[PDB]
Amino acid sequence: GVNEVPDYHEDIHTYLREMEVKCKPKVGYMKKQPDITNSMRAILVDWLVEVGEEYKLQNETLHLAVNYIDRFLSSMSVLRGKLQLVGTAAMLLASKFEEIYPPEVAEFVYITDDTYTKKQVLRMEHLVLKVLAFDLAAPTINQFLTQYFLHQQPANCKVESLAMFLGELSLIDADPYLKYLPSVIAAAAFHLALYTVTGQSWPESLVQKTGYTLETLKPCLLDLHQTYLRAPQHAQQSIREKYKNSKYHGVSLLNPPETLNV
């Protein structure tokens, strides 16, 4: 009913599709970063996963923060010793946007272990706002996933949680995931989860809404299935830890398929 906004879900879907293109980070940004690497960014995002878990933040807050960070690092060149400061301010901003009860600035100062002062966090907050021109209502993977979930017949909480898990893994690795739009990663995540859990595939009804097909989603799906397979080996493990929790139905303990039969 009204909680799924029957009279507006299409308008919103269409609007998120337009916006995700406007809010897109530059795919090639990292090579043009003299002093930071995908590896450093993976470390950062993994830390933000932990921070999110520590203060019991929404997963939306996490996705928003990563969006702000990637857009920020698309125009602004950052020394390795300041990357965490950008990340911290991103999390603050996202928290203030998305959270009912955002953590205090002092808590954000505390999680950095006195690397940075309160003044530096607040000044960077200002800088980030300047750089994004206050454009903070960004489409995220989650905003697409939650819509796709409405097409499950019937709903499976293991499918939903597994999809969330996969989408979150995607945030860690700028290569390859900077090149896919949130709506595409969400589409891959959803299909992979559904296949993993129930054996079923990306439904016809979602083709009618997204225009996306297994064909169109195949590049991303191949990347995502690799990420799923190698996830126990990744240097970064915070997402896997988080998704062992009962809250997310222990989905990080499910076994990936060996094949997609695509």
Binding site: G1, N3, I12, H13, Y15, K118, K130, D135, L136
Partner: protein, 302 residues
């Protein structure tokens, strides 16, 4: 964005709030009259307030003739200036100063129709207002009315998640919020407009309560106390109590006697208990109540 403080001349103070003061101002180069909302960030050792981050981030993307336009944001180290389209009056002051013998039925229809346009536009863009009351509806000299004050607005996901419970000025606050439901959606803004519609007819608030429990009671005494038949799930809601008095529903002819069949029909659909059956802004635009509205749609400005 375009501006700086040097190009504005202050004319007078026009309001205040949490953030601080609002001034009527004049662009000295273009001639444009604006409202300048000042936010103080120096007194704020919590950084930029979330209320302002939401107001700005959401208003940037809501260009619509029935939504007050955010023209610019001037971001000093020390201060934050929101430059808004200027509108001379709000609906509360109009109804309190010029509408003492009443608001004529043509002008009500026009206003409600425009409000519904603006709201439908918000909902179409993943945005709940969560604070619709007469004070927050600005009218200009051309007869346009526009949604203002997005300080309490929020970008929503589909389906919605649990959001803030302290939302909506009590007189305008939907039963689902009063009953502590885990989820609320676009129907809460429709409720508010329902209340406002009634208010425009009578020049008095429909449910003027002094407490949350009083607000519920006043609602129930008007629309009848809800049960499982009228509103499935009601009696399981967190702050629903079996002890609630069971008042009978009264005919809408008695709720707002001056209203006609079409108006009463619309009002009842705006004030339906079950949020799932409450009319959407999008659907309401086509209600027969509006068959005779004549006003050229206002123009979206730059």
């Amino acid at each position: 964005g375009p501006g700086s403080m040097e190009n504005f001349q202050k004319v007078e103070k026009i309001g205040e709030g949490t953030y601080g003061v609002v001034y009527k101002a004049r662009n000295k180069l273009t001639g444009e009259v604006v409202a300048l909302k000042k936010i103080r960030l120096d007194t704020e050792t919590e950084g930029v307030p979330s209320t302002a981050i939401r107001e700005i981030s959401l208003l940037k993307e809501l260009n619509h003739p029935n939504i007050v336009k955010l023209l610019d944001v001037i971001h000093t180290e020390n201060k934050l200036y929101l430059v808004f389209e200027f509108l001379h009056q709000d609906l509360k002051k109009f109804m309190d100063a010029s509408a003492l013998t009443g608001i004529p039925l043509p002008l009500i229809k026009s206003y409600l129709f425009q409000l519904l346009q603006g709201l439908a536009f918000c909902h179409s863009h993943r945005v709940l207002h969560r604070d619709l009351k007469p004070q927050n509806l600005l009218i200009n000299t051309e007869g346009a009315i526009k949604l203002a004050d997005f300080g309490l607005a929020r970008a929503f996901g589909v389906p919605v998640r649990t959001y803030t419970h302290e939302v909506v000025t009590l007189w305008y606050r939907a039963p689902e919020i009063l009953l502590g439901c885990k989820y609320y959606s676009t129907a809460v803004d429709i409720w508010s407009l329902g209340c406002i519609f009634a208010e425009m007819v009578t020049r008095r608030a429909l449910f003027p309560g002094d407490s949350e429990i009083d607000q519920l009671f006043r609602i129930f005494r008007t629309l009848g106390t809800p049960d499982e038949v009228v509103w499935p799930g009601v009696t399981s809601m967190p702050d629903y109590k079996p002890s609630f008095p069971k008042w009978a529903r009264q005919d809408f002819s008695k709720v707002v006697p001056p209203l006609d069949e079409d108006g009463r029909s619309l009002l009842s659909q705006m004030l339906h208990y079950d949020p799932n059956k409450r009319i959407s802004a999008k659907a309401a635009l086509a209600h027969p109540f509006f068959q005779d509205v004549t006003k050229p749609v206002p123009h979206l400005r730059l």
